[PDB]
Amino acid sequence: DSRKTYTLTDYLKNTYRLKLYSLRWISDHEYLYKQENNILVFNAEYGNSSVFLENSTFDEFGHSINDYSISPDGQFILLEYNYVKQWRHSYTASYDIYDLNKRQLITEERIPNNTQWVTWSPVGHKLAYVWNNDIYVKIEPNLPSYRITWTGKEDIIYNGITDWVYEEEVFSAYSALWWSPNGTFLAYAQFNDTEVPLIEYSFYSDESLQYPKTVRVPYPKAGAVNPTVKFFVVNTDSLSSVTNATSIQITAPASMLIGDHYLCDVTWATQERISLQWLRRIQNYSVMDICDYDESSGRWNCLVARQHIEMSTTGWVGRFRPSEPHFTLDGNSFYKIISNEEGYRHICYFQIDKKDCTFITKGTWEVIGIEALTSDYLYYISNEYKGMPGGRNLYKIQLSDYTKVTCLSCELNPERCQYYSVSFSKEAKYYQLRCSGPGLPLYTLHSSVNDKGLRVLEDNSALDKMLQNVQMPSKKLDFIILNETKFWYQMILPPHFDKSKKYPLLLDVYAGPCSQKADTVFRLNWATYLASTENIIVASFDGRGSGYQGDKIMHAINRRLGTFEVEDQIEAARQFSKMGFVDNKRIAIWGWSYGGYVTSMVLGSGSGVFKCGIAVAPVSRWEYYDSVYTERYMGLPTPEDNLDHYRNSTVMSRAENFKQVEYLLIHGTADDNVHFQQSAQISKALVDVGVDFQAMWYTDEDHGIASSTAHQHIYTHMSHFIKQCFSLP
Amino acid sequence: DSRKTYTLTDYLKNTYRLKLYSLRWISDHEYLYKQENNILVFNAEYGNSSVFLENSTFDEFGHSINDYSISPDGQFILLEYNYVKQWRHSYTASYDIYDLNKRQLITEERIPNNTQWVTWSPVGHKLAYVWNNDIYVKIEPNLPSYRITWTGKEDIIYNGITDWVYEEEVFSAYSALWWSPNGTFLAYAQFNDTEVPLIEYSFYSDESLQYPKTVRVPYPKAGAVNPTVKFFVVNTDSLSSVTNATSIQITAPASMLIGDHYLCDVTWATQERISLQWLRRIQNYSVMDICDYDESSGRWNCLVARQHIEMSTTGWVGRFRPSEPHFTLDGNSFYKIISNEEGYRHICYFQIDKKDCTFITKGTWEVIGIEALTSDYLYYISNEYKGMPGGRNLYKIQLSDYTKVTCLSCELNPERCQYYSVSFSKEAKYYQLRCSGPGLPLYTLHSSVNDKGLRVLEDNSALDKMLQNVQMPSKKLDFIILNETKFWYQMILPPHFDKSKKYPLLLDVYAGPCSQKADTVFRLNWATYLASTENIIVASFDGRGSGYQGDKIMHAINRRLGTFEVEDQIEAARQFSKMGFVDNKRIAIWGWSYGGYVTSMVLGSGSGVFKCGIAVAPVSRWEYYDSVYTERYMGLPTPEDNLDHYRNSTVMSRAENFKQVEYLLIHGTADDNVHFQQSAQISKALVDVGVDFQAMWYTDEDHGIASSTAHQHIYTHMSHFIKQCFSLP
Ligand SMILES: *[C@@H]1O[C@H](CO)[C@@H](O[C@@H]2O[C@H](CO)[C@@H](O[C@@H]3O[C@H](CO)[C@@H](O)[C@H](O)[C@@H]3O)[C@H](O)[C@H]2NC(C)=O)[C@H](O)[C@H]1NC(C)=O
Ligand SMILES: *[C@@H]1O[C@H](CO)[C@@H](O[C@@H]2O[C@H](CO)[C@@H](O[C@@H]3O[C@H](CO)[C@@H](O)[C@H](O)[C@@H]3O)[C@H](O)[C@H]2NC(C)=O)[C@H](O)[C@H]1NC(C)=O
Ligand SMILES: *[C@@H]1O[C@H](CO)[C@@H](O[C@@H]2O[C@H](CO)[C@@H](O)[C@H](O)[C@H]2NC(C)=O)[C@H](O)[C@H]1NC(C)=O
Ligand SMILES: *[C@@H]1O[C@H](CO)[C@@H](O[C@@H]2O[C@H](CO)[C@@H](O)[C@H](O)[C@H]2NC(C)=O)[C@H](O)[C@H]1NC(C)=O
Ligand SMILES: *[C@@H]1O[C@H](CO)[C@@H](O[C@@H]2O[C@H](CO)[C@@H](O)[C@H](O)[C@H]2NC(C)=O)[C@H](O)[C@H]1NC(C)=O
């Protein structure tokens, strides 16, 4: 054996890059793929291409265009420059509209600088943008903007944008603007954070800054006042400069109004029908209101009969939040993913006039998501193939005959692709199946008309040839029967693996509620380096609390976080140790966020199975985390509700047992998700008891700690600790 | 040998304690020494004792009495309970006045809770206290308080108390109240921090606290607006309840009014004469105003003729601040320590009517301080004995015949005591000479009448016997001739030291301007453990910038901090290495505060002499430290004045060279002196360049990091790092 190993340098410097083919379906037959800084239009059926915009077009722009947005009409394009990131999704940027017919930059009534969000109408060239927490609408790109809201304020009234809590948990986005299917109406949400308490952390900026800046973010910790959401809808077609626009408010269902409620999701059904999903602060009761517009009163009305209530007594409602409904063209019938009586999520045909729901799919698998609803077929990704919870394959079901279900990707390349994803065209005429593993990522375009594979867009052939030279580690995904239940685990076995020889084992852990750490995706990460060079088996286990395996396993840790999942990881290590190739004296664990919470808990468990551990940005007490996430799985922190578990599930409590393990606590000073407070309290507890541990603070670094320099430094420091603890060279 | 060694446990658990005899001279013949929780009165001449207050007296108090204050009359006592510390000197506490004649606790008009400062009149039982930044005076302990100021405000107007900058630099205390010699007048200072910018750091309090508290302290960084000081004097004898008291303001000399000025010190001369020392922001010009009270106008007047101006073109005026004048009983003549033309500080007889000053002492030594001015003799401590800059001995000079100077402690116990300190009685009839080394601390009481040693109060005999069993390390203080100048150094040689054998060397460093690290004091510190058990020579060197050696050496680093002192420490290590008993391959350096700045600078020097280093609470850029300290030595951070050196003296700049040394950066999150910001910037710089280093943040810990738990953990972690770097067992 005389080949190079995957070194940390290769990982940090991204020497081996996984080519990807990302396209934008502008039509049912054409998509826009950016090549050599040139936007190109590709006919899906023929396969030919044409230059939509030459790089020279914006070479004289004078600014670096971060991203572009083609108007549905295709007569205009948005240019994003001066991109400034805020949180995971939130950002501010300047925008310049470019005419694609006159080949000229719009210079009059330009979108203002620091625009928080900008969106084209679903059809046409209307532009709605949020500036200074305020919503403006430009009916024509070259015409003056029309201001809709006037109550926008910073860290108080968010109009059209989402506050930290909603952006990171409820909507998973920074956009609260929902255009009507033809762009007649614009649905928006007004979040009020007047009462939500502020988390205050210090920012040191650059060396030039003399006095540090304090950053205050409206952040509702478990039990703290949550934000108030108010939904609104405005007729954009009636927008006038003479008078302000009028926004009709759709009130929440009375059940939600009794107490704190959340607007989980907003989905347009027809040009005059909208579906609002509300969920009470106690996330075990959710009502969907199919509201329609009444022409006579010009006001949207929600029929109590059409309302659909989904309650869960076993645990929380939804994997992370109520799913999205896929209405039919008529809009009087919709398909949604609901949990079956057995406890496995499946598609359920729904009619707006019948509260009864008819499940169209059933089994011990789980419908991961609905991709497209054509008048004849509904396409969904599922983990049914080979009963593998970590597999994703495309399936289509005849709407008229539900019994006729056909797999579309299961038997394409079974050896190389088992985790598939899909992006259909405007009318689902053509779809791009993208496989992420277990082999190299493969991107292929197919035609729904005859389910025929038109061509292969990307095959990662060059990377494959380069990876032949390096001694890449192998990945093993199997299951261990615990309490007569199959719990799957993945193991990145080192190259030239010998079962007889005993190798050190690092248990990468997350164990988040409804999370999967054992899948079939090819990933070039730090574990690849650890297994290839340091020869460390990197393993991950999905125990009670893991998702894609049913409500029973997912809702097992309900109202008891830091209990079953922590125990399962320790039991996993014991099973892994007795397999025969694991050095019992050298077993470690590492995790990020919830993984850090579990990593700390297992190290302080006093089990004696683990020797050392690295907790990065770890959660210490659940009363320091946001309300939406914590209250969903731990309930309210009140003396009459799980207050005991809230206090019994703190890492600080197990500090005395940390004296038997080596601990590395890494955290970013400017973390908005898991505040540095949580890491700080862990350190204080260990210092008080006298536990000796290593720590590393990264100044002005967020939860991701992904700044090139910090990313390299964090993994370099972690590599040193793991090697030192494992007594490796 | 079988003798045990001084272990870290002995140091952390204070196994060997140095007994001390601290007394309070209530009279010229009697002092109060607390024994077994009983205040006892001891006649100095006879040596007999009597119980002033039995422990039972305050056993039923119900609170823990932190400290006591006997009224000069002795008819009343103050009891301090509920002690809450703020900064180094600032604190808040509740006080209960106790009658020492009626043996009863005063229950009416009690001193309010959270009293910031309380002081008895110099003679009598008057009480002046500052509550809520406001000054109140109780003429009688059992009578209602009289409020003097009414403009007090938190973090804005400090009346009678010193702001952070003045408390930690100018006055080195939290008291701005100065009682007149017979208590007729009360001199006070009003500090205004309305413009001084606030340093904001986060406090994580306890595990219960859900949201961290942001602590904002008025702190003037180099160049930032400094606080405004206004002096005032009030006649307490005329205090009435019917009308408010009137405070006469003594304005600063015109020279100081031209720009920012500081009130360095306030010293009362007679019952009607006060001496104010003012210093401009540019600390190289100071004027002392001897102001007297004019009965006719009832206003204090400062004669321009009586003003004494001291300017220094070589460097800053004063060791750290203008010295304190010692006026004669008449008050028309005073003695002060001024630097001579040669550049060595010496006592200088002064007359209020003659601007000329006559030096009464001269030589290549330095008068450390004036202790007592009797009508016939002036007592001062100096480093003249054996030309040792680190020695302190008591001397007395006949005022009539200055040639007649007599040493009082030089030849008492030359082998055991060379560093002496003294506390005279009310009329200097008796004085307690306390020696801190080089042998065990020895406390003795003497009589000035015939300079006779009455008796020995404490001899640390028990500690001496216990220290016989342990293998205590030895201390060597010598000098290395650099550039034809004697630079002294101390070395804590390990037990059973063999010059032939090569031992590892750790250079404890501070190198602060006007600082001494090589002295003759016996200290049981971490170095004792390192030398006794780990067998590491701990050495300290006093190079350019050191004090007690003359203005030339002290003012050498003027307007150039981080230059000569850093180079000298590296040169010291080179000289130490070629001595013959130092392992060149294993030399390290550690420091706190300025020591941390030097430690970082020498590690990033690129010299290659040092292998590893530990910087605790280190200063990174001088533009982050307070103004009074930085501007005194580095000038103003302005483009026209030393702005370059300010940017050329940053640790972050030498980050690339840290790649050759092991670095441990320890800092407390809640540091008010060296803000964490300085450590944070160092870390960010190393992270950016890619320098691998270890770090450790101590949550809710101040500059001292002296909380029992943290103190033990910091030295434990530091011990591990030093041993690991020195490849020690
Ligand atoms: C966002 O939430 C805050 C807090 O609920 C809202 O502030 C509230 O605004 C109402 C407006 O009517 C205030 O009611 C009035 O208060 C005044 C005194 O301030 C009183 O004289 C009136 O009789 C009436 O009660 C309410 O007090 C106030 N609450 C506060 C300040 O805590 C705010 O309006 C909300 N913003 C939006 C756009 O929804
Ligand atoms: C402590 O320092 C601050 C800052 O110098 C002092 O505040 C100042 O107070 C004076 C009072 O006369 C203000 O002057 C007046 O201001 C008002 C507007 O606020 C204006 O209408 C008047 O004609 C006059 O100029 C001055 O502006 C103000 N400076 C500020 C607020 O920055 C404060 O009084 C000082 N405190 C003490 C007790 O010395
Ligand atoms: C790919 O080739 C086809 C022809 O085989 C193109 O289709 C025609 O393109 C011409 C271009 O001038 C049009 O005038 C015709 O109307 C098109 N015919 C149809 C049926 O659409 C197609 O446009 C090409 N695609 C690209 C991206 O160049
Ligand atoms: C549209 O609404 C805005 C906001 O209320 C109006 O602008 C305000 O008009 C009032 C009139 O008294 C002023 O006091 C405010 O200062 C204005 N601005 C704001 C931000 O409140 C505007 O006039 C309305 N337009 C029409 C035609 O009704
Ligand atoms: C977009 O959709 C809206 C809602 O259906 C359309 O508005 C209605 O259009 C019909 C047909 O012209 C009218 O009879 C209704 O009175 C309209 N309702 C309202 C609220 O005005 C709108 O015309 C559609 N736009 C386009 C271009 O098709």
Ligand SMILES: *[C@@H]1O[C@H](CO)[C@@H](O[C@@H]2O[C@H](CO)[C@@H](O)[C@H](O)[C@H]2NC(C)=O)[C@H](O)[C@H]1NC(C)=O
């Ligand atoms: C949603 O969760 C709450 C909190 O667990 C449930 O309220 C409890 O209901 C049970 C009976 O089912 C009572 O014994 C408890 O005392 C209630 N409160 C608490 C604090 O547990 C509520 O019933 C749940 N709702 C649904 C639809 O399951």
Ligand SMILES: *[C@@H]1O[C@H](CO)[C@@H](O[C@@H]2O[C@H](CO)[C@@H](O)[C@H](O)[C@H]2NC(C)=O)[C@H](O)[C@H]1NC(C)=O
């Ligand atoms: C130490 O002893 C001396 C006597 O040798 C004490 O002096 C006398 O003490 C009595 C006590 O009742 C007084 O009445 C006398 O007036 C004292 N004489 C003088 C000259 O002072 C002295 O008080 C004793 N000291 C202590 C602390 O008990």
Ligand SMILES: *[C@@H]1O[C@H](CO)[C@@H](O[C@@H]2O[C@H](CO)[C@@H](O)[C@H](O)[C@H]2NC(C)=O)[C@H](O)[C@H]1NC(C)=O
């Ligand atoms: C002593 O000074 C205080 C402070 O100025 C006086 O108390 C104030 O009196 C005014 C009279 O109009 C009130 O408006 C204030 O509210 C009072 N308090 C404060 C804190 O300002 C007090 O009256 C004065 N006493 C005498 C006898 O003059």
Ligand SMILES: *[C@@H]1O[C@H](CO)[C@@H](O[C@@H]2O[C@H](CO)[C@@H](O)[C@H](O)[C@H]2NC(C)=O)[C@H](O)[C@H]1NC(C)=O
């Ligand atoms: C404390 O000292 C002050 C200042 O010397 C004395 O006040 C003066 O006392 C003399 C003598 O009685 C008077 O002639 C002056 O008019 C007083 N000046 C003022 C400002 O009142 C005061 O008497 C001394 N107190 C005691 C008890 O000796």
Ligand SMILES: *[C@@H]1O[C@H](CO)[C@@H](O[C@@H]2O[C@H](CO)[C@@H](O)[C@H](O)[C@H]2NC(C)=O)[C@H](O)[C@H]1NC(C)=O
């Ligand atoms: C106090 O220090 C300041 C700053 O160094 C001195 O001002 C400088 O004086 C020199 C001459 O001695 C000039 O060449 C400089 O231009 C002055 N300004 C600066 C920015 O350096 C001042 O003279 C000193 N005062 C005394 C009494 O020594």
Ligand SMILES: *[C@@H]1O[C@H](CO)[C@@H](O)[C@H](O)[C@H]1NC(C)=O
């Ligand atoms: C711009 O596009 C042309 C298209 O032929 C390509 O050759 C050229 O390399 C591109 N330049 C950049 C900087 O991408």
Ligand SMILES: *[C@@H]1O[C@H](CO)[C@@H](O)[C@H](O)[C@H]1NC(C)=O
């Ligand atoms: C954005 O800022 C730049 C720079 O000040 C300015 O030239 C431009 O006109 C601004 N755009 C808008 C729409 O305000």
Ligand SMILES: *[C@@H]1O[C@H](CO)[C@@H](O)[C@H](O)[C@H]1NC(C)=O
């Ligand atoms: C209180 O004082 C008496 C004086 O004889 C002493 O015996 C006793 O030990 C003291 N108690 C404490 C707790 O110091």
Ligand SMILES: *[C@@H]1O[C@H](CO)[C@@H](O)[C@H](O)[C@H]1NC(C)=O
């Ligand atoms: C201080 O507070 C305690 C507790 O409330 C109270 O008993 C006491 O009287 C207070 N003292 C004064 C002087 O206010």
